[PDB]
Amino acid sequence: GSHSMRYFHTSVSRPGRGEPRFITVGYVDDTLFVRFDSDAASPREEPRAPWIEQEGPEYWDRETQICKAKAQTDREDLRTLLRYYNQSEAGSHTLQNMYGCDVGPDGRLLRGYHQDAYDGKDYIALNEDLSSWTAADTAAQITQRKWEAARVAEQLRAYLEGECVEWLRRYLENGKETLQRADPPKTHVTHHPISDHEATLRCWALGFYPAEITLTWQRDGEDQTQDTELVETRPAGDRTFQKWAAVVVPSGEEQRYTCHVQHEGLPKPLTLRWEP
């Protein structure tokens, strides 16, 4: 299927408690494969998936230098944004950035990303054209003018169309045992009486990869979107994910309810029912 590579970065200032903490992680699809934490005893880019361990020492040197430089520029930018927003030096603030690429089954670029947030709000984003910027406010417009004057977008476009896709394709081949394997959900319905009048039907999806999935309840063939309790997809800790959807059902009417499951590891969507 389709694939993605993403690098995530977070810097959090902490006035009076040293310099901002910097954490960055890299993902292919939903698999974490590299990390760097400035608060580690000896900060270095570290592998987190077996298929990246084979990369040589020069790779880990390069990635570590880039992460360290990113931590330093983030520190400078945190001071800059205090000025842009007329903020006191006394508070903690957050700078986030994500960038990366999406490719289709043939490995062609589907789209690229590079976007930033300040204190959890969108700040500046490279548009899908990979050539223009969307600034959220007048402070981000100051960055936009700087980045336009330096033609930053053209440097990002070159990376996202070139190295990002080329190295994603290499990682997909080196990790093809895992990165190119979808694990379908294991599904079942449980029944939990609430009262003499109602019971919860809970539709489970377990052990699936990647995280994207659709679980829905129907009653007499009609979607129950408004009456379904849907928990956020959650990691099991073994690479796979879990999710459930629940509906409250009048006692005796359980067979009018069907759970429907869509996942890229399933050839055709599943339909299941409570089985007493």
């Binding site: 880039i66 990113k70 330093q72 930018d77 500046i124 440097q155 990002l156 990376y159 190295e163």
Partner: peptide, 10 residues
């Protein structure tokens, strides 16, 4: 691998 010029001054 990472963008070598991802450290960009805002």
């Amino acid at each position: 691998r990472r963008f070598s010029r991802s450290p960009i001054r805002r």
